[PDB]
């Protein structure tokens, strides 16, 4: 057998799937600088914004006249929101409820209304229904979350709570995220109604049978939706994640306002204008960032790495190896039995472990890269 996680001679065997590795250079894998000293950065602003009063609000608006709000400049703790079982439905479609606690957005939208218990499934992406098509329409890319919970003891009256109304007939559909207030007559035939009375002319105001004796699947469930945006503004509505101190010119991992990435940060001679929030250069790779608090420009390159290659001259000839790291200045490597040793050499294509430069000149055989080549 062969261990494929031990010494580089054995790892060459594991890739070529043989016990007899011929002389030369093979590709083993890729290497990376693992990050340490994890850094996480948010803006200064740290007050809470009351989503709770919106969650725990006694009277909502209608299904076709849903109330819409924009929230900014807060931190919201989704952990106290996540574990709570007071909502009958808590489902997030475009996102996972457990991972909201890490990312920070801005311009969060919440629309609330009251609906029957069976229709709490209707508020979902790709769903058709009465209120899914005539009172509130949802896009196919509707990322976010929705919350419903029963309110039969409160939103149902013994005389019949008819205050929760909805439109029954309309000429056409409704666009997603629009509100109508015009309570107008419906033409159901060929006679133009002009809003008085009579057949093929119906009043869209019509009621529900809300009663406190009514059980599950028809109770008034208060439904609140949670909609988010992706990367239009400097993010203000953060999650329950704190901050730390930032370090430069060392391969770290960073959470800059919900933007997760890896690399070495250093001081940038570029010129951010004050309207700028962050940077990118080519094809959606964030090339420079100004931090959310000290408001100074850093630039990001993901920390230097490449492939690892093994120089072994054949398992019949010897057992000693050399290891190439592709394209790294061989100082930012943190194999600790080899890395500290007799000689470690640095190439224009990276660095060499277990090998010493000689002044010689040979008709070389095992290529390394950058014009240097290795041999036993």
């Amino acid at each position: 057998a062969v261990d494929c996680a031990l010494d580089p001679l054995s790892e060459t065997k594991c890739t070529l799937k043989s016990f007899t590795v011929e002389k030369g250079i093979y590709q083993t894998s890729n290497f990376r600088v693992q990050p340490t000293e994890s850094i996480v950065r948010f803006p200064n602003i740290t007050n809470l914004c009351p989503f709770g009063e919106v969650f725990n609000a006694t009277r909502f608006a209608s299904v076709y006249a849903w109330n819409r709000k924009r929230i900014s400049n807060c931190v919201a703790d989704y952990s106290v929101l996540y574990n709570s079982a007071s909502f009958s439905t808590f489902k997030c479609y475009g996102v996972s409820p457990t991972k909201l606690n890490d990312l920070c957005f801005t311009n969060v939208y919440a629309d609330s209304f009251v609906i029957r218990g069976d229709e709490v499934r209707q508020i979902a992406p790709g769903q058709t229904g009465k209120i899914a098509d005539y009172n509130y329409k949802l896009p196919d890319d509707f990322t976010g979350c929705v919350i419903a919970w029963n309110s039969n003891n409160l939103d149902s009256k013994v005389g019949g709570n008819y205050n929760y109304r909805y439109r029954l007939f309309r000429k056409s559909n409704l666009k997603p995220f629009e509100r109508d207030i015009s309570t107008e007559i419906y033409q159901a035939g060929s006679k133009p109604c002009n809003g008085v009375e009579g057949f093929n002319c119906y009043f869209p105001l019509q009621s529900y049978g809300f009663q406190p004796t009514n059980g599950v699947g028809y109770q008034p469930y208060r439904v609140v939706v949670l909609s988010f945006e992706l990367l239009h503004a400097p993010a203000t509505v953060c999650g329950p994640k704190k901050s730390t101190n930032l370090v430069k010119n060392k391969c770290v991992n960073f959470n800059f306002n919900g933007l997760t990435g890896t690399g070495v940060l250093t001081e940038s001679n570029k010129k951010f204008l004050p309207f700028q929030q962050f940077g990118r250069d080519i094809a959606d790779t964030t090339d420079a960032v100004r931090d959310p608090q000290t408001l100074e420009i850093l630039d990001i390159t993901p920390c230097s790495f490449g492939g690892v290659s093994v120089i072994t001259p054949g398992t019949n000839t010897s057992n000693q190896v050399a290891v190439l790291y592709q394209g790294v200045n061989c100082t930012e490597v943190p194999w600790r039995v080899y890395s500290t040793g007799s000689n470690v050499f640095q190439t224009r294509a990276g660095c060499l472990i277990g090998a010493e430069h000689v002044n010689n000149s040979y008709e070389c055989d095992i290529p390394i890269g950058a014009g240097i080549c290795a041999s036993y």
Partner: antibody
Framework: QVQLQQSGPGLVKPSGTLSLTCAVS?????????WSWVRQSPGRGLEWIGG???????NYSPSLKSRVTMSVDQPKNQFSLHLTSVTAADTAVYYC?????????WGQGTLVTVS | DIQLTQSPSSLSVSVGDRVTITCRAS??????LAWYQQKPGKAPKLLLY???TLESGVPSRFSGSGSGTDFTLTISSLQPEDFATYYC????????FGGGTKVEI
């Protein structure tokens, strides 16, 4: 729900009369609801007869315009049907139902079986 | 007046497959049609209406399409207790319930 409860006796003799009633629970009559009735004859299926408005205006089908008159009781919260000269072709389950064009909520229906 | 010519009426198809109920009218009832479910010995129960808007409590396997003199009520998966008479009813004028398709086992 708009529950519509039908009440009274059901067995009748041939060439007799049916005086049927539909009590309304859960919907205001003072609204745009047309409080209507649907019978179920064999061969004809369900057939739209007509409905009433709470002010008294009415619209019927021409096959059952000549025999049906209906009235409204707003504080009693009901609506009725009157069939004059119930024939053997009226062997049908008569369903009171709330209408605004569509019939979103129904009564359960009484079959008229003359015996 | 606008009359309703049904198509499904009676049919004997097996479980879970597609059931068509075609209701054809004389004139344009493009937005004006309802679609009920009546078990024999029970009350009718409205499935769809008002240009494919579904009634609260009705599942989403039932879909509506069509406009004018071509309409449909579709059951994506038939059940044994789905033995019911499925009427079309327009409201472009004085209404009329269709013949009703008694979908049989």
């Amino acid at each position: 729900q708009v529950q519509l409860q039908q009440s009274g006796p059901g067995l009748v003799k041939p060439s007799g009369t049916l005086s049927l009633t539909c009590a309304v629970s859960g919907a205001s009559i003072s609204s745009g609801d047309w409080w209507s009735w649907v019978r179920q004859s064999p061969g004809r299926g369900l057939e739209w007869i007509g409905g009433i408005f709470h002010s008294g205006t009415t619209n019927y089908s021409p096959s059952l315009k000549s025999r049906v008159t209906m009235s409204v009781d707003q504080p009693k919260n009901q609506f009725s049907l009157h069939l004059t000269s119930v024939t053997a072709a009226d062997t049908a389950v008569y369903y009171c139902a709330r209408m605004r064009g569509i019939f979103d909520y129904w009564g359960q229906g009484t079959l008229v079986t003359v015996s | 007046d606008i009359q309703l010519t049904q198509s499904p009426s009676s049919l004997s198809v097996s479980v879970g497959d597609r059931v068509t109920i075609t209701c054809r009218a004389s004139q344009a009832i493009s937005n004006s049609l309802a679609w009920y479910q009546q078990k024999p010995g029970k009350a009718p129960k409205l499935l769809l209406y008002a240009a494919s808007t579904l009634e609260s409590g009705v599942p989403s396997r039932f879909s509506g399409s069509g406009s004018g003199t071509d309409f449909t009520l579709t059951i994506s998966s038939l059940q044994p207790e789905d033995f019911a008479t499925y009427y079309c009813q327009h409201y472009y004028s004085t209404p009329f319930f269709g013949g009703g398709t008694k979908v049989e086992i």
